[PDB]
Amino acid sequence: LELRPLGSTGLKVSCVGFGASPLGRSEDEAVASVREAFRLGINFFDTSPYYGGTLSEKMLGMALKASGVPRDQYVVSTKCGRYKEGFDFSAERVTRSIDESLERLQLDYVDILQCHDIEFGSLDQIVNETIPALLKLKQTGKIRFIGITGLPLGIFTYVLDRVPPGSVDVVLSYCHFSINDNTLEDLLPYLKSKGVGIISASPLAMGLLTEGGPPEWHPAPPELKSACQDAAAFCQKKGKNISKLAMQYSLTNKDISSVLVGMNSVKQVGENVAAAIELVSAGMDQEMLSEVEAILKPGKNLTWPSGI
Template sequence: ASPPPPATVDLRELGKTGLKLSSVGFGASPLGSVFGPVSEDEAIATVREAFRLGINFFDTSPYYGGTLSEKMLGKALKAVGKPRNEYIVSTKCGRYIEGFDFSAERVTKSIDESLERLQLDYVDILQCHDIEFGSLDQIVNETIPALLKLKESGKIRFIGITGLPLWIFTYVLDRVPPGSVDVILSYCHYSINDTTLEDLLPYLMNKGVGIISASPLAMGLLTERGPPEWHPAPPELKAACQEATAFCKRKGKNISKLALQYSLSNKAISSVLVGMNAVRQVEENVVAVLELETSGIDQETLSEVEVILKPVKNQTWPSGIQQT
């Protein structure tokens, strides 16, 4: 007889941090109303449902919704009232609605502001947000040393860096003392249409760095609702994703489920962050995780979608000030 299905989402080790993250993580940027308005009640109900189904990892940033995401997440965490050691919160520094500032002074002040909005005493991970928009040498020489001091003070437990181009990670990790950067967060590079993160995984694992991959739905490209108006993808990528979505719909399949399962299939990735702003989405995403564990991915539909997306495979968009 086959074993009973797991009741909740599986946990995965994050590099050498000792943290065990739910394989699907809660991306809280939608709580900042960046994909459409979200009420406080909806935010609380969504976070409550995430906890109920075994999601223990919540990611936000002062940038999302101009601090609204952090405030909403803080209210929701407080309303749900779980013990602090039963969940993991990551937020970010250096990117704000007013612009970028990775100076030691700004990021040191930033964590106090974030903790206040989140109504927490510490965050588990503080990440430099979208470092390709700053000077990477400043990140190495000034920002990371400032975050190491915050680590000593107990306001943060671990340090991360995030961004879109993949070369930024090796640039920084090759230059900082081993063990100072605990985590990287990559986005839009491990989904059905773009798998370029794959080549970097051996390097990251060799460094002992924890790997978080965000935006398995390519920031809305692989959803029936479609991407938000600000989505930076080139028109041919948007069109191909729309075609793949329509194809799945005609077949009675849900592209978002397939896309999430695809990202979750690589166990080198500790957590796949999906943006969620509705109870129904949490439920759908958790069902996708549990089904992947029990029955595997729908290989036939995946192959068909891969054919549709082949002409735009690994297409991305420019980000930051230092292109290579």
């Protein structure tokens, strides 16, 4: 499984990343799925205190501890500022938050601590308070690199234009590098000019690019939902899994160091790693990709509101 350099961190992360949110919804299952992740070459695990109301961090912590893998051979990301009780990006809260996370994860440090969904905060507080607090955490050694995450791509230019250079190491984007929406491409030259690492997520656009369709809470507009429904049904009659195609598409730009995918079974781990390996050894079904992109054209790059 291909490892890609993550910005200027000197880390190398697997192009498929283990999104641990589903581990917050048993323990044997969480242990088995993380073990198989390591077996197949995955070395990157992302979580948040928000996921499962802190249960994801606890389950990942236990599964990593049962793995027997040396801690410096993998990379752990968690987040601060977004909780089941809501949002709090204050210096006091994120300083307490890393100690809460480290206890649940049974770790001595996280490689990356990211501000979670900053479009729900004041971006000026993120710049002037939150990120300077994480820089002090970096001096304690409890974290090694600093990230920001959220949906609207403009949060990343807003923050990165205004911090002292080098303050932010990594960016976590989601829903903007899949067949339906690849606008994260626009941001890559900006982020590379700064040496900032790039991680993406939701390669299936939170279930739009699946045969079963999006969940009932999905915020996409009807035009995008209609296009994706038509694409999935096109694949279903051709005997093709639109989700495998979408996952492979998500992996075709090596400037994105890793695409995180939410996983909670050995099967899902194997399926996603097998998509990645197939992409590298056989290439991608170009005819299928072309047809699906034509069908998705009415929904291309449509997004939805997020934050305040």
